Amino acid sequence: SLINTKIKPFKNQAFKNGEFIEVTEKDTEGRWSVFFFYPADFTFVCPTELGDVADHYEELQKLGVDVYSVSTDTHFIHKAWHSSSETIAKIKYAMIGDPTGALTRNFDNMREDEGLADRATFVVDPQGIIQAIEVTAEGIGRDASDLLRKIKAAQYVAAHPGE
Amino acid sequence: SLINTKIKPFKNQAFKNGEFIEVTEKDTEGRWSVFFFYPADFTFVCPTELGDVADHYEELQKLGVDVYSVSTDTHFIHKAWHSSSETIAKIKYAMIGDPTGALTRNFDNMREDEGLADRATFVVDPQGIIQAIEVTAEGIGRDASDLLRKIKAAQYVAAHPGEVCP
Amino acid sequence: SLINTKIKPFKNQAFKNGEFIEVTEKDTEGRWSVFFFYPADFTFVCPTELGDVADHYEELQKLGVDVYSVSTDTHFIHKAWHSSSETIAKIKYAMIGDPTGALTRNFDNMREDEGLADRATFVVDPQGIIQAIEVTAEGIGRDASDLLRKIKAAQYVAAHPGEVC
Amino acid sequence: SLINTKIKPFKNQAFKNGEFIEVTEKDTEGRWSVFFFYPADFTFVCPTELGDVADHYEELQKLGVDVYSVSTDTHFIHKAWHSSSETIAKIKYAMIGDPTGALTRNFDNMREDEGLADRATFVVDPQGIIQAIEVTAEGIGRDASDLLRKIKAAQYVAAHPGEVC
Amino acid sequence: SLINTKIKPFKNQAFKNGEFIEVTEKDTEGRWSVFFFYPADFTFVCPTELGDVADHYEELQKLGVDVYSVSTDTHFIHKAWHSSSETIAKIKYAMIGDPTGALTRNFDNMREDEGLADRATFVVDPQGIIQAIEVTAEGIGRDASDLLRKIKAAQYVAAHPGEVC
Amino acid sequence: SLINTKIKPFKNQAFKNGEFIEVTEKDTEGRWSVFFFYPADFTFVCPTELGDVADHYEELQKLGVDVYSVSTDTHFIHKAWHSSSETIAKIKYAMIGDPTGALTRNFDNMREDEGLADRATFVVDPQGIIQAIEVTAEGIGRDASDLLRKIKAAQYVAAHPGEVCPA
Amino acid sequence: SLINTKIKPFKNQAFKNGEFIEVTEKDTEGRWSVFFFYPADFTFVCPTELGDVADHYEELQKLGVDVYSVSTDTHFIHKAWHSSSETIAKIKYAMIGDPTGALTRNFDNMREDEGLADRATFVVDPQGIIQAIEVTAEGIGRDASDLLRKIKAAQYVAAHPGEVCPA
Amino acid sequence: SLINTKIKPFKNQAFKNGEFIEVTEKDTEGRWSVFFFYPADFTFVCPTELGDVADHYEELQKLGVDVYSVSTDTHFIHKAWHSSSETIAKIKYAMIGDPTGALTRNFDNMREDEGLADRATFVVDPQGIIQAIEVTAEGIGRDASDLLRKIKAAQYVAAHPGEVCP
Amino acid sequence: SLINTKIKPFKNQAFKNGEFIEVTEKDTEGRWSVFFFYPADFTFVCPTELGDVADHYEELQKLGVDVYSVSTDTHFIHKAWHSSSETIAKIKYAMIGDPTGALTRNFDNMREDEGLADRATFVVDPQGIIQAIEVTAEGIGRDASDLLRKIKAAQYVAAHPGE
Amino acid sequence: SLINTKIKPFKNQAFKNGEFIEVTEKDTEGRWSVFFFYPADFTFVCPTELGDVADHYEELQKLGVDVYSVSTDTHFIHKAWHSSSETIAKIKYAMIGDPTGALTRNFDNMREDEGLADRATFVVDPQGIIQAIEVTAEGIGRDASDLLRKIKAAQYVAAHPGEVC
């Protein structure tokens, strides 16, 4: 299992607020990270999950938390989608492209026979330790609010060991 | 990963409403199941999580959803803890004891250094397929209400496949 | 080399004229096929090659030649690119999505460190045999006309076997 | 068997007179130790074996001996069972929790089928050498006094090597 | 450990009251058996353990029990030692020779370093299941009577399963 | 395919204008190269592809492009073929002999059950990188004019990166 | 060595008197065969060994012995060589082409770092058994008269077993 | 095979003239040795063979040849058998006990089904090289006199190498 | 070890009383066999051992015992030697040639770095069981008389199990 | 093939003109060597081949060519055959014994099922390279004259390298 293990090194391109950048594990060192995996861009499922995380982005940045959405589409696809979907256009966090599937396989989150990642969210602390894991099948939504909660809770525990 | 896979056979002793019973994957077939793993009985940690599931058990049973709490403690320990804690006494669902760690390992949820299961919840549909997973580190709490919402959602998609977006 | 070998079984989702279909090697049996690989949808380079092929599509269908463009993007991406680009909008042939990379690996055409397919074109006869292969680096365009010429020439050979000179 | 071999290192949590402590091979160096393995806390069987040992405890501590009861239950469970049981409440020695089962396995005393240790008592000298072993099935009792005789002898033979007839 | 497992088959030569016989797992089926392992014949240590068992022998035979002393010495040696020793001459039970060491190994009771078995006593029920085990180092004595108590209990628990408190 | 990989080291004998020379990868460093593989000399098939490449050899050379034809025949055979065929007589570029099939296998271009190379053309840039690959079955011809266009496009892209048409 | 073993199955194209034929092991069954391997056609070395075997081909045929020369060149090359050399023009026995080197490797006669066969002659009897092997380095010639003597001795021993000189 | 090979290290307890000693390959270095293996002490078999070696021991010692009888019985058993049998009591050479079977296996001489050594004799020269081997089945006897003859011969060739034939 | 094990199958040529024959394990079935290995024919060591066995051949045949001398020389060499040595000329038993070394390796009796057999004698009963083994280094002779003895003894035991 | 390869190290005993010597690859360094293999000494066929070579020995030594006949018989056998056969008695070159078969296997010339070497001749130059190989079946004689011719021709080549024609 991945709970309480250190994330692995990775180098991927991403689209963030209009620009293409490179993201590596080194960019997460010293910060709280949220890796939000989803299956694919441009499908016919409601973009709900991604938009809700965006709504809470304001607050997450205030807690020193970075958000990285991840799919096996290229960063090019993320850019296009960011212009086609009003829900996705709200995204200001980095949208990582994982065409090789390496970032996804890092978190053992690949649907091997589909070439797409499963709907999984991971919460990683400044030291690269996964503190919270959430995975659901298609149609079973992830609650942004509950994610926030888990994160604040994850932060408390880091500053108040045992109680 | 475990998401979208079928649970594995198992055979454990559990404490359910005063008596000792035996649970196997057989009991889960044809039903919706929630496996709620936790680290340990009789610890200075607030049993809030188990009590909270207890609070939703009635609505859960009403929806055809069984609940099994799991720990590497024996089922004898669960009996004692049940007739000892005001919060644990509210539990009417089965409390599986997994001292071989087998049930816990089937779900790849063992803290190999402590011999205790991690804080994880799994939702299993009638065909034995895992549809929802949740694991948290010590101190991070699980919201029974959130669990309930997902279960309803999982039950909805089983009934309404390919629900495109309006 | 893959020249003169039989293509391998595959099963992919594709986007064809507004509809989503499934393509497998069965669909190629008895026909002449062109598998046109390219790296990715929605990049910044112009889809000239794909468009050039669209222009000759009608003529290719006359020769009984089916065309399947392939990239590791999903068929969903193809539908969106098709309705966002004038050039892509001209495409009437099937656009296969290969997210698992299996189709691309069947033709040993994957840039493993990129997860994208190389710019390679394969001409397959009715018996499933590869008769022509073309691969180029970014910037070196594949000419649809030379492609037609090769196909007619391959079709000729199949009709007039062992033609001395 | 493990007879006459040196105990393997270990580190476990334990309950001893209202407090949690940590035991390791270190606490046994240069000391006569007794390891008392039993299957489970809060069972329905009579805690006789543990309590019978509890009694002879004062005498033991005198002979320079230490008592460690060991179960695959956590030490949290031991503290609890030391409050709901008269017999268990008499235990002044350390009650070790072995949830990972490592301590039990070091002694090859694990019922792999149940995840519970078998009924075995071991006698370890100050050098960490097992001098006496006793294993009995569920129901057959272990004589507290006989164990004492074993210690006496083990201790004598330790002082007066080679006692030819 | 071997506690609660079925003894492995075997075939050894033995000395019993002036005659050589052959013992096998067959002779233990449907019978309470006691296996008494000791290091060596004609040693300088006191044959007390063997003779102390010899005494309680009549009683044992009554409870439907059988006694088998086992040593890695051949059975020829056992006949001899039963003529030069008063204590050994009291043995009316079978004295098994285990030169190949197979019987000792079945019970994982071999000092591989010496080629001699350790001091271990086993109690096997009619089903061939080990109910009690006792291993002690050179010098620490095995209580003949305590063994009897173990048999009594083992036998009771055999008759009256589950004796909840 | 071998697209975008560096050619492997090699050492072969060749026939170049009445002479026998040795060719190695060093000969290609800093230059644009075209490795033209064909099945066999002295066969009954029209040596069209080879004569066509010969015709454009003038143009190619003006572009700084070297041409090397390759087959599993020995260089001795090339020297012979060059005296009996009017077409092959037009050839002025080096005709490499690859009897061990090492060069051929380097470009993964061997018909293993024949011991003959397949009809393939490779364009290799000054740094030894393969920029264009073409393989065809017997009967399907290779167009030298389309090769030239590719070569010029490869040189243009090398000289002017990221100047590709914008969407 | 391969002495006293049966030749392995094979299928090659050859040039035999202005014609292209296929040769397999079946062609050798029931006959006496001579497989004459050489390095390459059209080289600068005197085709002595091949012309010498040609001269004695009359005699050999009168003895029921078939001759097959073999090299890694293709049969097309043999047909060509047969028109440019007066010596090779004397050849009337089949000239086998072995481009895949399979025949050559069957007789463990390949110079692996050259893709060329070594100078070796094998005498194979009607049952396909190798009765005589001869391999020489470049420059050391093979004597056709000594080959004939060996062939006749092989036939004599086949016809009259155990008639060897007594000590 | 063992002929012409060097014996292997070993360490055993033995009974020699009333006392217990320890023998190792160390004691054999620089000396001529005879390892005389036999199946078992206190058996209804006639100890004739051991007694016969005893009879030649004096001449053997005179020639610088040590003798070690070997059995898988313990050295305690040898003491008893020595002060019990009139024939075995004539033995003044070491009686090695090999209950681990190690010494016996070094000479590849174990009857794996009985845990007893086969009837075999080995002659080892000062450099530890085996120069003579002899093994027989139960009932076939070894002639101590023949053994003596070979030893003298072995000692002769060590002193006179390459003795061609007259 | 080989004591009390069954001999292995073998097929070798041999010289016996002027004629070349073939010997196989099947020729030993039902009889008592003596396999007498020696290093080499025509050396400068006294042929003593072989001549003494010959002197006792008369008697051995009377006990139903066959004798097979064995060396890695060919049967041809044995013939020649049988004509050159007056000691060897007394031999009427079979002299087996073992050029391949297979018979020798059967009895694990090969000096691998010399390609010659060690001086070893084996006694085999009607059932193919080796009852007696004797091996010596060069210069240490084998006594024919002692061999005879062992054989008679081997025969007694076969007809009087235990005593 | 072994043609054009360097011989391997070897160490054998040989019989040469009444004396026993040791031969190793060192003895071949700097000289021209002929390794003449044959199946066996003392068979019934006449030693014509060996004798034919003896006849040309003097001439071979003039060319600086050493000759070593080889068979799997021992050198002892060679001494005896030499003084029992008129033909063999004419031999002045070294007769190597190869009882281990190592020399014969170095030249891959062993008939494994017979333990005898095949009728093969190898011409080795001063640098240890095999320049000529000849192998024949029983009954097909190897002509010493053709052998001389080949050697002179090989020697010529070494003197006049790459001589065109």
DSSP chain I: --TT-BPPP-EEEEEETTEEEEEEGGGTTTSEEEEEE-S-TT-SS--HHHHHHHHTHHHHHHTTEEEEEEESS-HHHHHHHHHH-TTGGG--SEEEE-TT-HHHHHTT-EETTTTEE-EEEEEE-TTSBEEEEEEE-TT-PPPHHHHHHHHHHHHHHHHS---
User: Who's near H38: CB < 8 A, 6+ residues apart?
Assistant: H49, H50, H69, H70, H71, H117, H119
User: Who's near E26: CB < 8 A, 6+ residues apart?
Assistant: none
Strand partners, C42: none
Distance to chain E for D136, nearest Cα, Å = 4
Tell me which of G3, G46, G63, G89 is the catalytic residue.
G46
Number of H helices, E strands in chain A: 5, 9
Asked whether D143 and E148 are in contact (CB, 8 A), the reply is: no
Contacts of C115 in chain A (CB under 8 A): 72, 98-101
CA-to-CA distance for F152 and F148, rounded, in angstroms? 6
The angle subtended at Cα F13 by Cα F12 and Cα F14, nearest 5°, is: 120
Asked whether J113 and J14 are in contact (CB, 8 A), the reply is: no
Contacts of A148 in chain B (CB under 8 A): none
Asked whether D105 and D99 are in contact (CB, 8 A), the reply is: no
CA-to-CA distance for D60 and D67, rounded, in angstroms? 8
Number of neighbours of residue B10 by Cβ within 10 angstroms:
22
Distance to chain J for I74, nearest Cα, Å = 8
Q: Output DSSP code: residue B128.
A: S
Q: In Å, how far are A68, D92, D138 from A61, measured between CA atoms?
A: 12, 54, 60
Q: Output DSSP code: residue E140.
A: P
Half-sphere exposure of D11 (CA within 13 A, CB side): 2
Please report, as a single letter, which amino acid is at residue C139. G
Torsion from C-alpha of J40, J43, J44, J46, nearest 10 degrees: 40
Alpha helix (H) residue ranges in F10-123? 48-55, 57-62, 75-84, 86-89, 102-106
- Please state the φ and ψ torsions of residue A110, each to the nearest 5 degrees: -95, 140
The first and second tokens of residue J92, run together, are: 């002045």
Asked whether A22 and A12 are in contact (CB, 8 A), the reply is: yes
Residues of chain F contacting C, Cβ within 8 Å: 1, 3-4, 44-46, 48, 108-111, 118, 120, 129, 131-141, 143, 146, 149-150, 153-154, 156-157, 164-167
Q: Do B100 and D77 touch (CB under 8 A)?
A: no
Of A134, A140, A143, the CB nearest to B154: A140
The first and second tokens of residue A145, run together, are: 């609010």
Number of neighbours of residue D125 by Cβ within 10 angstroms:
21
Any idea which residue has 């041409």 for tokens?
A: F67
Distance to chain G for F71, nearest Cα, Å = 11
Distance to chain G for F79, nearest Cα, Å = 9
Contacts of E119 in chain D (CB under 8 A): 3
CA-to-CA distance for E96 and E107, rounded, in angstroms? 14
- Please state the φ and ψ torsions of residue I73, each to the nearest 5 degrees: -75, 165
User: Who's near C12: CB < 8 A, 6+ residues apart?
Assistant: C22, C23, C24, C70, C75, C96, C97, C98, C102, C103
Q: Which chains touch F (3 or more CB pairs under 8 A)?
A: C, G
Mutate: best of G37, G105, G124, G136, partner J, most J CBs <10 A:
G136
Asked whether D69 and D40 are in contact (CB, 8 A), the reply is: no
Tell me which of B17, B24, B26, B46 is the catalytic residue.
B46
Nearest CA to A56 out of A138, A127, A142 is that of: A142
CA-to-CA distance for H4 and I138, rounded, in angstroms? 10
Q: Output DSSP code: residue E25.
A: G
- Please state the φ and ψ torsions of residue A131, each to the nearest 5 degrees: -105, -25
Distance to chain D for E161, nearest Cα, Å = 9
Residue-wise burial string across J10-24, b where 16 or more C-beta atoms lie within 10 A, e elsewhere: bebbbbbeeeeeebe
Strand partners, G36: G69, G121
- Residue J71 host element (H or E): strand J65-71
User: Who's near E47: CB < 8 A, 6+ residues apart?
Assistant: E85, E87, E88
Contacts of A140 in chain B (CB under 8 A): 131-132, 150, 153-154, 157
User: Who's near B23: CB < 8 A, 6+ residues apart?
Assistant: B10, B11, B12, B13, B14, B68, B94, B96
The angle subtended at Cα F117 by Cα F112 and Cα F121, nearest 5°, is: 135
Please report, as a single letter, which amino acid is at residue I76. F
Asked whether G55 and G88 are in contact (CB, 8 A), the reply is: no
CA-to-CA distance for E7 and E106, rounded, in angstroms? 7
Q: Do F42 and G77 touch (CB under 8 A)?
A: yes
Any idea which residue has 């090695």 for tokens?
A: H96
Number of H helices, E strands in chain B: 5, 9
Strands (DSSP E) found in G31-93:
32-37, 65-71
Experimental method: X-ray
CA-to-CA distance for A93 and H154, rounded, in angstroms? 94
Residue-wise burial string across D8-37, b where 16 or more C-beta atoms lie within 10 A, e elsewhere: eebebbbbbeeeeeebebeebeeebbbbbb
- Give CA A150 to chain center in angstroms: 15
Tell me which of E46, E63, E153, E157 is the catalytic residue.
E46
Mutate: best of C12, C13, C42, partner A, most A CBs <10 A:
C42
Euclidean distance between the first and the last CA atom of chain F, given in angstroms as a whole number = 28
Of H118, H134, H138, the CB nearest to I134: H134
Tell me which of C45, C46, C63, C135 is the catalytic residue.
C46
CA-to-CA distance for I18 and I9, rounded, in angstroms? 25
Q: In Å, how far are A20, C141, D31, D67 from D64, measured between CA atoms?
A: 73, 90, 7, 10
Distance to chain F for G60, nearest Cα, Å = 30
CA-to-CA distance for C60 and C36, rounded, in angstroms? 14
Q: Do E1 and D118 touch (CB under 8 A)?
A: yes
Q: Coil, strand or helix: which one is B31? A: coil
Print the domain residue range for I56.
1-163
Asked whether A91 and A54 are in contact (CB, 8 A), the reply is: yes
Tell me which of J45, J46, J89, J153 is the catalytic residue.
J46
Strand partners, E120: E37, E135
Asked whether B15 and B46 are in contact (CB, 8 A), the reply is: no
Q: Output DSSP code: residue H89.
A: G
Please report, as a single letter, which amino acid is at residue F133. I
CA-to-CA distance for I79 and I74, rounded, in angstroms? 9
- Residue H57 host element (H or E): helix H48-62
The first and second tokens of residue F108, run together, are: 């993964």
Tell me which of D6, D9, D24, D46 is the catalytic residue.
D46
Number of H helices, E strands in chain J: 6, 9
Strand partners, C135: C120, F133
Strands (DSSP E) found in chain G:
11-15, 20-24, 32-37, 65-71, 94-97, 110-111, 116-117, 119-124, 130-136
Any idea which residue has 């070497």 for tokens?
A: J117
User: Reported resolution in A?
Assistant: 2.5
User: Who's near D94: CB < 8 A, 6+ residues apart?
Assistant: D14, D15, D16, D21, D23, D66, D67, D68, D69
CA-to-CA distance for I70 and I39, rounded, in angstroms? 8
Contacts of H4 in chain I (CB under 8 A): 111, 118, 137
Q: Coil, strand or helix: which one is A45? A: coil
- Please state the φ and ψ torsions of residue H10, each to the nearest 5 degrees: -160, 165
Q: In Å, how far are E123, H40, H56, H76, H163 from H68, measured between CA atoms?
A: 41, 15, 13, 16, 30
Q: What is the CATH number of the domain that holds J25?
A: 3.40.30.10
CA-to-CA distance for J18 and J89, rounded, in angstroms? 10
Q: In Å, how far are C102, D64, D112, E45, H79 from D146, measured between CA atoms?
A: 72, 17, 29, 22, 36
Any idea which residue has 């990775």 for tokens?
A: A10
CA-to-CA distance for F40 and B149, rounded, in angstroms? 73
Q: Do A76 and C100 touch (CB under 8 A)?
A: no
Q: Do A4 and B137 touch (CB under 8 A)?
A: yes
CA-to-CA distance for J95 and J74, rounded, in angstroms? 10
Number of H helices, E strands in chain F: 6, 9
Q: Do A112 and C100 touch (CB under 8 A)?
A: yes
The number of folded domains in chain B is 1
Asked whether D41 and D47 are in contact (CB, 8 A), the reply is: no
A with C: how many residue pairs have Cβ under 8 Å apart?
Answer: 60
Q: Coil, strand or helix: which one is D51? A: helix
I with J: how many residue pairs have Cβ under 8 Å apart?
Answer: 60
Strand partners, D15: D20, D95
Q: Coil, strand or helix: which one is B54? A: helix
Among chain I residues, CA nearest to H106: I1
The angle subtended at Cα H157 by Cα H152 and Cα H159, nearest 5°, is: 95
CA-to-CA distance for J155 and J125, rounded, in angstroms? 8
Number of neighbours of residue A152 by Cβ within 10 angstroms:
13
- Give CA A33 to chain center in angstroms: 8
Nearest CA to H33 out of H67, H57, H69 is that of: H67
Please report, as a single letter, which amino acid is at residue E128. G
Number of neighbours of residue I62 by Cβ within 10 angstroms:
8
G with J: how many residue pairs have Cβ under 8 Å apart?
Answer: 112
Chain E meets chain G (3+ C-beta pairs below 8 A): no
The sign of the CA dihedral F25, F28, F32, F34 is: negative
CA-to-CA distance for G41 and G53, rounded, in angstroms? 16
Of C40, C72, C99, the CB nearest to A114: C99
Strand partners, I71: I97
Distance to chain F for G125, nearest Cα, Å = 29
Half-sphere exposure of D77 (CA within 13 A, CB side): 29
β-strand pairing of D11-15 with D110-111? unpaired
- Residue E24 host element (H or E): strand E20-24
Cα R_g (chain F), whole angstroms? 15
Asked whether J163 and G139 are in contact (CB, 8 A), the reply is: yes
Q: Output DSSP code: residue B87.
A: T
Q: Which chains touch B (3 or more CB pairs under 8 A)?
A: A, D
Q: In Å, how far are B19, B59, B65 from B55, measured between CA atoms?
A: 21, 8, 14
The first and second tokens of residue G136, run together, are: 């020489």
Q: Do H165 and I118 touch (CB under 8 A)?
A: no
CA-to-CA distance for J51 and J57, rounded, in angstroms? 9
Asked whether C14 and C22 are in contact (CB, 8 A), the reply is: yes
Contacts of A118 in chain B (CB under 8 A): 1, 3-4
CA-to-CA distance for G42 and G50, rounded, in angstroms? 13
Q: H159's torsion region: left (phi>0), alpha (psi -120 to 50) or beta?
A: alpha
Distance to chain A for C57, nearest Cα, Å = 27
Please report, as a single letter, which amino acid is at residue B102. A
Mutate: best of H98, H100, H114, partner E, most E CBs <10 A:
H100
Question: Contacts for H160-165 with beta carbons within 8 Å, 24 or more apart?
Answer: H163/I139, H164/I44, H164/I45, H165/I44, H165/I45, H165/I46, H165/I47
Distance to chain F for G111, nearest Cα, Å = 9
Strand partners, C133: C122, F135
Q: Coil, strand or helix: which one is E41? A: coil
Residues of chain E contacting H, Cβ within 8 Å: 40-44, 72-74, 76-77, 79-81, 84, 98-101, 112-116
Q: Do E164 and D45 touch (CB under 8 A)?
A: yes
Q: In Å, how far are D23, D27, G86 from D63, measured between CA atoms?
A: 20, 16, 115
The angle subtended at Cα F64 by Cα F63 and Cα F70, nearest 5°, is: 110
Among chain G residues, CA nearest to J137: G131
Q: Do G146 and J141 touch (CB under 8 A)?
A: no
Asked whether E43 and H77 are in contact (CB, 8 A), the reply is: no
Does D46 participate in catalysis according to the annotation?
Answer: yes
CA-to-CA distance for A25 and A68, rounded, in angstroms? 12
Residue-wise burial string across E55-67, b where 16 or more C-beta atoms lie within 10 A, e elsewhere: ebbeebeeeebbb
Please report, as a single letter, which amino acid is at residue B1. S
CA-to-CA distance for B71 and D158, rounded, in angstroms? 45
Chain B meets chain H (3+ C-beta pairs below 8 A): no
The angle subtended at Cα D13 by Cα D10 and Cα D18, nearest 5°, is: 145
Q: Do E136 and D135 touch (CB under 8 A)?
A: no
CA-to-CA distance for H104 and F112, rounded, in angstroms? 61
Q: Which chains touch E (3 or more CB pairs under 8 A)?
A: D, H
